[PDB]
């Protein structure tokens, strides 16, 4: 199946002299497995998934040492950015970073990622080729020159093609029981009247894993994309996911509307209708 | 496993 590994960093400045907060979270697909928070007397990376607890003290220390250094360097990066946008020490600012690798059905490197944001918007990103950068403005062009001089792109390409896919392969093996499993959704349709002789059809999808799903409403065999209420995929808490799709439907003395569910856990796509 | 940032990797 299609699998990915991602690290999400946040570097928040404290208003207006305080030590900035560095947080790192590690994901395997949508499953969180590591967390490091700089705000603690003795910060250590913590396991967040059961299948990562088998890893040795050398592994936990390698993570902690990287994240304790990022804490120091991201503090300096927050100072550099403040200077490019002529911002004062008063005011909270944030660097957001996400990087990692994707693998297709075949466990080989598909695509590598390395994106950064300053205060919620795109700042600098590594291109698909993994050898060039996309800078948002003249301030992200200063970062680009520094990174080109430091060969950041080469080293990330070595990491994404190497270490990243190897460790993702390892995590996928040790967590196969929960990570390589596929859980099909439990589907059912609900009907509610919105106003006088006007109804709303809501098709539910529950207990599915992974979160990749598609719910569509077809009127007499045609996709009704804009008229639909496609709610965001939400976690159940039990590591599975849930979603629903709604449509404003007139009574019209007949039923021409059907919902279509497509999920990796289904051997054949489902077609459901309101059964009163 | 995260990546280690070498020297001068700042923004």
């Amino acid at each position: 199946g299609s699998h990915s590994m991602r690290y999400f960093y946040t570097a928040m400045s404290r208003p207006g002299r305080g030590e900035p907060r560095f947080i790192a979270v590690g994901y395997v697909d949508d499953t969180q497995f590591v967390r490091f928070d700089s705000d603690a007397a003795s910060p250590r990376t913590e396991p967040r998934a059961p299948w990562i607890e088998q890893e040795g003290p050398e592994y936990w220390d390698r993570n902690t040492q990287i994240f304790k250094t990022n804490t120091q360097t991201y503090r300096e990066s927050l100072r550099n950015l403040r200077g490019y946008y002529n911002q004062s020490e008063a005011g909270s600012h944030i660097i957001q970073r996400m990087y990692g690798c994707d693998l297709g059905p075949d466990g080989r490197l598909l695509r590598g990622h390395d994106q950064s944001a300053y205060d919620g918007k795109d700042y600098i990103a590594l291109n698909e080729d993994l050898s060039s950068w996309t800078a948002a403005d003249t301030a992200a062009q200063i970062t680009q020159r520094k990174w080109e001089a430091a060969r950041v792109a080469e080293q990330l390409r070595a990491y994404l093609e190497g270490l990243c896919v190897e460790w993702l392969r390892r995590y996928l093996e040790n967590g196969k029981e929960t990570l390589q499993r596929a859980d099909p959704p439990k589907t059912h349709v609900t009907h509610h009247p919105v106003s006088d002789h006007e109804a709303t059809l809501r098709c539910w999808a529950l207990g599915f894993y992974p979160a990749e799903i598609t719910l569509t409403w077809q009127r007499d065999g045609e996709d009704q994309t804009q008229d639909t209420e496609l709610v965001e995929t939400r976690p159940a808490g039990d590591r599975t996911f849930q979603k629903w799709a709604a449509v404003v439907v007139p009574s019209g003395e007949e039923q021409r509307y059907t919902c279509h569910v497509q999920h990796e856990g289904l051997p054949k796509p489902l077609t459901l209708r309101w059964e009163p | 496993h995260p990546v280690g940032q070498a020297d001068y990797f700042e923004y």
Partner: T-cell receptor, first 112, second 110 residues
Framework: DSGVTQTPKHLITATGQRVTLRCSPR?????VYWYQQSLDQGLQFLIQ???????AKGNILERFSAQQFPDLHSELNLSSLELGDSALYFC??????????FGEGSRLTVLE | QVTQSPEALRLQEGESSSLNCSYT??????LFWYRQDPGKGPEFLFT???AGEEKEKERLKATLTKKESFLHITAPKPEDSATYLC?????????????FGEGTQLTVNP
């Protein structure tokens, strides 16, 4: 060739004494790496400084200390010297490209 | 982590040989070759980054695989006599610190 300047080049002292080694990185380099080369043994990483602050620690001993100054120069302090502290002490500075440029070294000879 | 072989090379002038360097890292950042003359400090020769990458300067040629690096010396002269150090940087480590091998001490018999 190379640009890193170390001093003193040679030091002779007795056991229980304290010595201080100095290192200036290459012009433009902001890091200082301290290395020890004991006899028969190879180069061992002691400590790294970056733009005035401690950044990484090797197998540096508790009676050894170092510092990087705001003008980027560095000082290695070796206390309560032992015969086994006789070695070559090198420091390096890294270029933005990632390469370490070493100094010529400081030969410490500790006598009883 | 880094082991060099042989610890000592005893070569006749003009007699080519290749110095070995075995390494183990989480992931390779860069592999370095230095030359160290007695008294002086390590002098940079080459940096290799990926498997199959070759670099050449005058009589020296360095090559890299997933497990080792070779420093091939073609027709050595007595002025090639020195200790050859091999060092690696790891991607699972912060900064640019080098972990060195114990070195190959070459002597070229003129």
């Amino acid at each position: 060739d190379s640009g890193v300047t170390q001093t003193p080049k040679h030091l002779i002292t007795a056991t229980g004494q304290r010595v201080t080694l100095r290192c200036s990185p290459r012009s433009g380099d902001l890091s200082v790496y301290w290395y020890q080369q004991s006899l028969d043994q190879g180069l061992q990483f002691l400590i790294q400084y970056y733009n005035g602050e401690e950044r990484a620690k090797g197998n540096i001993l508790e009676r050894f200390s170092a510092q990087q100054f705001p003008d980027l120069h560095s000082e290695l302090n070796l206390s309560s010297l032992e015969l086994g502290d006789s070695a070559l002490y090198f420091c390096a500075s890294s270029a933005r490209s990632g390469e370490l440029f070493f100094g010529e070294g400081s030969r410490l000879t500790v006598l009883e | 982590q880094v082991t060099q072989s042989p610890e000592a090379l005893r070569l006749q002038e003009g007699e080519s040989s290749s110095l070995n360097c075995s390494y183990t890292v989480s992931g390779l950042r860069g592999l370095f070759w230095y030359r160290q003359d007695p008294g002086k400090g390590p002098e940079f020769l080459f940096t290799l980054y990926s498997a199959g990458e070759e670099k050449e300067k005058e009589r020296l040629k360095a090559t890299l695989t997933k497990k080792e690096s070779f420093l091939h010396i073609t027709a050595p002269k007595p002025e090639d006599s020195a200790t050859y150090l091999c060092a690696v940087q790891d991607l699972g480590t912060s900064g640019s610190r080098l972990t060195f091998g114990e070195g190959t001490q070459l002597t070229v018999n003129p």
